[PDB]
A paper describes a structure:
Mitochondrial ribosomes (mitoribosomes) synthesize proteins encoded within the mitochondrial genome that are assembled into oxidative phosphorylation complexes. Biogenesis of the mitoribosome requires trans-acting assembly factors that chaperone rRNA folding and guide mito r-protein incorporation. Here we used cryo-electron microscopy to determine nine structures of native yeast and human mitoribosomal small subunit assembly intermediates, illuminating the mechanistic basis for how GTPases are used to control early steps of decoding centre formation, how initial rRNA folding and processing events are mediated, and how mitoribosomal proteins have active roles during assembly. Furthermore, this series of intermediates from two species with divergent mitoribosomal architecture uncovers both conserved principles and species-specific adaptations that govern the maturation of mitoribosomal small subunits in eukaryotes.
Docking of the backpack module and 3′ rRNA stabilization results in platform compaction and rRNA ordering similar to that observed in humans. In states 1 and 2, the pentatricopeptide repeat protein Ccm1 localizes to the 5′ precursor of the 15S rRNA in a position that is subsequently occupied by mS47 both in state 3 and in the mature yeast mtSSU. Ccm1 is therefore in the unique position to chaperone mitochondrial pre-rRNA in a co-transcriptional manner similarly to eukaryotic ribosome assembly factors binding to other 5′ precursor elements. The exchange of Ccm1 for mS47 is coupled to the irreversible removal of precursor rRNA that is accompanied by conformational changes of the mito r-proteins uS5m and mS26m, and additional ordering of a flexible linker of mS45 in state 3 that is previously absent in state 2.
Numbering used by the authors:
A (entry chain 2): 30 to 128
B (entry chain D): 2 to 76, 88 to 205, 372 to 486
C (entry chain L): 78 to 149
D (entry chain V): 2 to 159
E (entry chain P): 2 to 106, 110 to 120
F (entry chain 6): 27 to 222, 291 to 345
Write the structure that this text describes.
RNA sequence: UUAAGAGUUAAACCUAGCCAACGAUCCAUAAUCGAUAAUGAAAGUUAGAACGAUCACGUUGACUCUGAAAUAUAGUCAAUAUCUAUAAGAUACAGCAGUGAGGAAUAUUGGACAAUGAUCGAAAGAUUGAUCCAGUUACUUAUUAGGAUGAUAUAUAUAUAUAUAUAAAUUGAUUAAAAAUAAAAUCCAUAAAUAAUUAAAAUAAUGAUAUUAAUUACCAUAUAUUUAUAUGGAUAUAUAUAUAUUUUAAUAGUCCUGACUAAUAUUUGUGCCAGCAGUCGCGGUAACACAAAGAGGGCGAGCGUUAAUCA
């Protein structure tokens, strides 16, 4: 069933803004309808055009909202500035000598 | 499986698991399998050829070799042990259908299974290679069995021509009866071995020309009315069933009408129960086959060693 | 009998019989050699494969085309 | 495929099942008696003779079998907490429940394993005793045949 | 999870048709390597239910074969079961709600029943 | 010695003479036409012995050896009719004594070459209904009825199942006129039989759960899929079975 | 010295021993094995790809720290080979794809962490070429790859063996010489499509596979036990309602026919040539063996052949 929009996240626009990971580009897909966002399963989000990662993340955060768990942006893991562990040594050697 | 090719060739004279008229003639004229003046390899090859032409022809040779079981089962006369060479094929669903007289041939049984017309214990089975166990109940859609055992449904044109001929012959008989009722009554009683109103009761029938009547079935249905054939075209009493509608058995059905010993059949419902695997007992083998024991012996010797 | 000496990729030099009614094998030609001796030729223990390498299949072959590389 | 005929025609292998009790228990009287029994003396036996010396650094006798005591193993391996009284903790209740279940499971497993071993020992005793009374039965049967002794000398007896 | 000894699922079967062995395994061995023991089998595909059986009200059944005495022993000595294995054991009654998780956890339509 | 032997009839038949060049016929086709007899405008072969099914509860099986290939009778009088030099069918000179003197066993033998093959007797509907009453209503065991009627237990159980199914079909009016005709006809074509523990846990089910776990007790060392077991997927001994739905699954 | 025995290593002092024609030492070769694969009646024999167990290695050799355990895919040193950053630098794809070479010959520079595992984190969660899926490839194995009927066209006039005419009739052949029920034609189906719906792999939620499998040919419900008749939403029609209610197929190669070794219906070209051949062997007008036609016999999405293994 539909959760009721909260003052913290009044609209699906604000929801996509908060969850992040470039989910803001999906605003037109949902047309700012709470009911559509909270009844649309994975097959529908696929036929709309949402990619696999985006629809999985959106369904995860929608379930979190149903269960009132925090829906803040989870920044994805990134390789270190000095490169991956396997490439860390060569990249560090290059960076040190160059600068 | 193998593609059906020259299964009824009169020259080759092979007997097939089928109710064909040509298969009937091949079985009739065969006599027996000639094994005289042949080396052991030639005898084995002839026996293999004939028995595999009858038993499981549609199976590929390698598949049959894999399916071949070098053992035999049995339960005063001598028990024909080696007629059980092909008993393993008898538990297959298509073979069971054929032996239950629910299909005209094993190929037609395969098509019936593949098209979803067959059930085994209430669940639809679409695989002819399905193997039945003792006590298994299988059933066929009644229309398919009626089509397999019933005569072919004529087309509109052919039945219209047959009706033309029937009307013509009825008019001829009516003329003969009216002109000379004496001799007609005498002939009728002789064939069985007076009142003049009888010849008055007979009525001519309007001749029909098919050129104007083609393409309209209800017109012909209403126009054609013979004392046996009232208000329908020949063989098309209700042209929506897949068989000769006034249901009569297919021609040449009695030669192949064999009741199995391992299946129990209810033809009202088109159901059957697989009682057991066929077995050999003193003086009898439950594996229906048109070849005598030596032929099966030689085939078994062939398939024990793979034709070595 | 049409045959040819062939040096194989492993260094061995053998004599290979050339089957078929006609052949276009010539020196420097790339061929494929399989086993099977020519019975009436002593020392020729190998055959050349028609329709493989630089050796074409038999021209105008109707029967046993697969054994001679012919296509139809 | 051939070797599977030895193992019941089962293809593939399971890992060898582990023994819950690594060493024999102290309630297995027969094993202790065999261990404690006088070792067979001499070469058909297993031990050094009285007069012969062993190598300087070696041990004359093998290490003695450590007979597990199930009560001691349970007490040392899984000991009930001394401090029964405690206050409310969100994870403490869960940890206590898990610890209680694990203790119960291990205690139950050990005790049932010991009972199982003793039951097999009793079963073997019954088997052997029944076989010995079967020998007594043929003793009864033979005397019937040889109650017919005319005390003349026969060839089958020769 | 944690610990050297872990009760987990090793995948057997064929592509698109998974079956599993519930096994006690060393944490550092491969998933399908030979384990310390094979405690059981698990078939994740529910039993098919006919439409008429749906009218009857029968529910699809997922089949697990398990050694209950030995699994309890391995839980006692400190074996750590995986999440899916933890769920499987909980439904069997080997483990209680103490092994649950916040995400996992409602009305009971059928209660766990033990019959020979 | 072995050679291709065209399967000509073993019995005497009228071989082709000089042929008009465009006939393009064969002796085999002429033998088939002689065996079949004249064809009707309706397509039938009334002259043939076996064209029409029997109705006297005695099967009509081919007897090419006894009748020496003469398989044409008058459809009504059922007297033999042989081909004649004029081309017409007519009475034979001497009637075959073999066809009057036919052993009772041979009449139930479908195929002339195989004596061991024989047709099975068909149980009468009254006997089937009596068996149904004896088993289901009177509570008799399959053993007692099997001994009583000289029947076998699997056949008795199959008869019970079939009579129950027939009762259901008659309840739903599924049996039709054509089916009744087909059953009746095939009934008269055959001879008629003459009477004289493991602990199991069913798991807790919660609303929204689509399945219920079933746990069976098993013994370690015997439960599990073995490691290193032989793979027969690419071998002729590949193991195939059928699902509960009826689909094909590799085992 | 080790946690630990021992010429295992290092030192010292004694004895003269130790192995070996039932094969030492040396050389060549080789990863080993199974409840794995092949084969055989079996003993055995072969393989060690695939599933599984053990070992060894991560370009080569030695040593060192840490550690319970490493001569570690670590570090140091050197050897080889490359790249730049020219430094008491980095890298070595026997990790996944992929490229070049070698070879008769062995694929995607793919999708996802949905499932099962693994690492980190208290958790939220993050990573995962392990893994799971898909792609290529008849490399192998299995199911399908359509059944029944069917030897001719017209014209004549409660019975029923309908009979007469004419016309045609492909290849071979003049009757046991066939191709051939093979074709055509007819009857009845289903696959595919087109529509709806729709599981399961997974649940608290998350599905890459996915244009999912499966079901029905309008859709539900309402009773009976899959087939029925009903009630209601579809449906064009004609004139709410009598009616019907998507469409629909067919698609085989390859070898051989003297004997071993299954293949009789016969002909043509060549002429010890061209050629065939596993063995015997055939080919000089009369070729069952060469190259073909007809017919025929095997296996069949495979067939043959070469290389091997067992018997
Ligand atoms: Mg972060
Ligand atoms: Mg953790
Ligand atoms: Mg021959
Ligand atoms: Mg020392
Ligand atoms: Mg030494
Ligand atoms: Mg020294
Ligand atoms: Mg030596
Ligand atoms: Mg090596
Ligand atoms: Mg090696
Ligand atoms: Mg391997
Ligand atoms: Mg070896
Ligand atoms: Mg490999
Ligand atoms: Mg190393
Ligand atoms: Mg190294
Ligand atoms: Mg390298
Ligand atoms: Mg690579
Ligand atoms: Mg190359
Ligand atoms: Mg993952
Ligand atoms: Mg990836
Ligand atoms: Mg001609
Ligand atoms: Mg040739
Ligand atoms: Mg010639
Ligand atoms: Mg030859
Ligand atoms: Mg030739
Ligand atoms: Mg030809
Ligand atoms: Mg295949």
């Amino acid at each position: 069933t539909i959760p009721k929009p909260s003052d913290q996240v009044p609209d699906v626009d604000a929801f996509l803004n908060k969850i992040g990971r470039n989910c803001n580009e999906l605003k037109d897909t949902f047309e700012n309808n709470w009911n559509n966002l909270f009844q649309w399963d994975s097959k529908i989000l696929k036929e709309k055009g949402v990619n696999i990662q985006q629809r999985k993340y959106i369904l995860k955060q929608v379930h979190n909202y149903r269960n009132n768990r925090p829906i803040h942006e989870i920044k994805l893991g990134k390789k270190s500035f000095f490169g991956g562990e396997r490439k860390r040594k060569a990249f560090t050697a290059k960076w040190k000598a160059e600068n | 499986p193998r593609k059906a090719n020259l299964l009824k060739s009169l020259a080759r004279g092979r007997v097939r698991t089928s109710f064909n008229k040509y298969n009937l003639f091949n079985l009739y004229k065969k006599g027996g399998v000639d094994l005289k003046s042949k080396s052991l390899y030639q005898q084995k090859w002839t026996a293999k050829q004939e028995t595999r032409a009858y038993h499981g022809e549609h199976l590929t040779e390698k598949r049959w070799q894999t399916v071949f079981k070098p053992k035999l089962d049995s339960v005063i006369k001598e028990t024909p042990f080696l007629l059980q060479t092909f008993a393993v094929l008898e538990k297959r669903l298509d073979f069971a259908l054929f032996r239950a007289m629910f299909a005209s041939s094993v190929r037609q049984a395969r098509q019936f299974i593949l098209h979803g017309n067959v059930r085994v214990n209430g669940v639809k089975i679409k695989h002819p290679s399905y193997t039945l166990k003792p006590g298994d109940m299988f059933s066929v859609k009644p229309d398919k069995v009626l089509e397999a055992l019933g005569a072919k449904k004529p087309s509109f044109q052919e039945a219209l021509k047959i009706d033309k001929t029937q009307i013509v012959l009825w008019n001829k008989y009516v003329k003969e009866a009216k002109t000379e009722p004496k001799e007609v009554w005498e002939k009728k009683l002789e064939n069985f071995e007076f009142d003049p109103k009888w010849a008055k009761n007979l009525k001519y029938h309007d001749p029909i020309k098919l050129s104007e009547l083609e393409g309209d079935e209800p017109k012909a249905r209403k126009l054609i009315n013979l004392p046996w054939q009232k208000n329908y075209v020949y063989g098309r009493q209700d042209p929506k069933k897949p068989f000769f509608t006034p249901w009569k058995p297919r021609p040449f059905l009695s030669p192949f009408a064999i009741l199995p010993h391992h299946l129990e059949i209810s033809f009202k419902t088109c159901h059957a129960v697989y009682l057991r695997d066929p077995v050999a007992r003193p003086g009898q083998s439950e594996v229906i086959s048109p070849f005598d024991v030596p032929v099966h012996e030689r085939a078994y010797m062939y398939y024990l060693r793979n034709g070595k | 009998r049409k045959a040819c000496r062939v040096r194989l990729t492993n260094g061995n030099v053998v004599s290979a019989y050339i089957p078929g009614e006609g052949h276009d094998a010539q020196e420097h030609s790339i061929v494929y050699v399989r086993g099977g001796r020519c019975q009436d030729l002593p020392g020729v223990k190998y055959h050349v494969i028609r329709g493989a390498g630089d050796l074409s299949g038999v021209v105008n072959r109707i029967s046993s085309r697969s054994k001679y590389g012919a296509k139809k | 495929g051939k070797g599977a005929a030895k193992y019941g025609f089962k293809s593939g292998v399971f890992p060898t099942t582990r023994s819950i009790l690594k060493s024999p228990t102290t309630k297995q009287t027969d094993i202790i008696n065999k261990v404690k029994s006088p070792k067979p003396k001499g070469v058909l036996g297993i031990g050094y003779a009285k007069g012969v010396k062993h190598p300087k650094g070696s041990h004359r006798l093998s290490p003695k079998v450590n007979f597990i005591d199930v009560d001691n193993l349970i007490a040392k391996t899984v000991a009930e907490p001394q401090s029964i009284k405690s206050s409310n903790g969100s994870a403490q209740k869960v940890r206590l429940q898990k610890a209680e279940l694990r203790r119960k499971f291990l205690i139950e497993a050990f005790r049932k394993e010991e009972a199982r071993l003793l039951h097999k020992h009793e079963y073997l005793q019954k088997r052997t005793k029944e076989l010995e009374k079967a020998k007594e039965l043929e003793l009864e049967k033979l005397n019937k045949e040889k109650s017919s002794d005319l005390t003349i000398m026969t060839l089958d007896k020769m | 999870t944690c610990g050297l000894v872990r009760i987990r699922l090793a995948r057997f079967g064929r592509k698109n048709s998974p079956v599993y062995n519930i096994v006690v395994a060393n944490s550092r061995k491969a998933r399908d390597a030979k384990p310390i023991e094979v405690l059981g089998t698990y078939v994740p595909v529910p039993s098919p239910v006919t439409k008429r059986e749906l009218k009857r009200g029968v529910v699809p059944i997922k089949d697990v074969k398990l050694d209950f005495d030995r699994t309890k022993y391995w839980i006692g000595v400190g074996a750590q079961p995986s999440e899916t294995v933890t769920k499987l054991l909980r439904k069997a009654g080997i483990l209680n709600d103490a092994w649950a998780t916040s995400k996992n956890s409602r009305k009971v339509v059928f209660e766990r029943m033990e019959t020979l | 010695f072995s050679r291709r032997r065209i399967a000509y009839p073993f019995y005497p038949f009228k071989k082709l003479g000089r042929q008009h060049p465009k006939k393009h016929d064969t002796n085999l086709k002429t033998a088939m036409r002689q065996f079949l007899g004249p064809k009707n405008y309706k397509g039938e072969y009334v002259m043939n012995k076996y064209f029409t099914v029997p109705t006297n509860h005695v099967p009509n099986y081919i007897k090419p050896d006894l009748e020496r290939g003469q398989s044409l009778e008058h459809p009504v009088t059922k007297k033999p009719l042989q081909l004649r030099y004029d081309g017409t069918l007519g009475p034979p000179p001497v009637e075959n004594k073999r066809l009057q003197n036919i052993f009772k066993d041979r009449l139930l033998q479908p195929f002339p070459s195989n004596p061991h093959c024989k047709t099975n007797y068909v149980l009468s509907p009254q006997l089937k209904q009596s068996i149904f009453e004896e088993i289901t209503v009177e509570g008799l065991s399959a053993q007692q009825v099997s001994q009583k009627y000289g029947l076998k237990i699997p056949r008795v159980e199959a008869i019970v199942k079939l009579v129950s199914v027939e009762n259901s079909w008659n309840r739903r009016n599924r049996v039709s006129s054509d089916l009744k005709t087909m059953d009746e006809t095939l009934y008269r074509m055959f001879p008629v039989f003459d009477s004289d523990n493991t602990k199991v846990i069913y798991g807790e089910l919660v609303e929204g759960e689509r399945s219920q776990y079933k746990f069976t007790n098993a013994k370690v060392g015997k439960v599990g899929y073995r490691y290193g077991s032989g793979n027969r997927d690419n071998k002729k001994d590949r193991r195939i079975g059928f699902n509960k739905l009826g689909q094909m699954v590799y085992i």
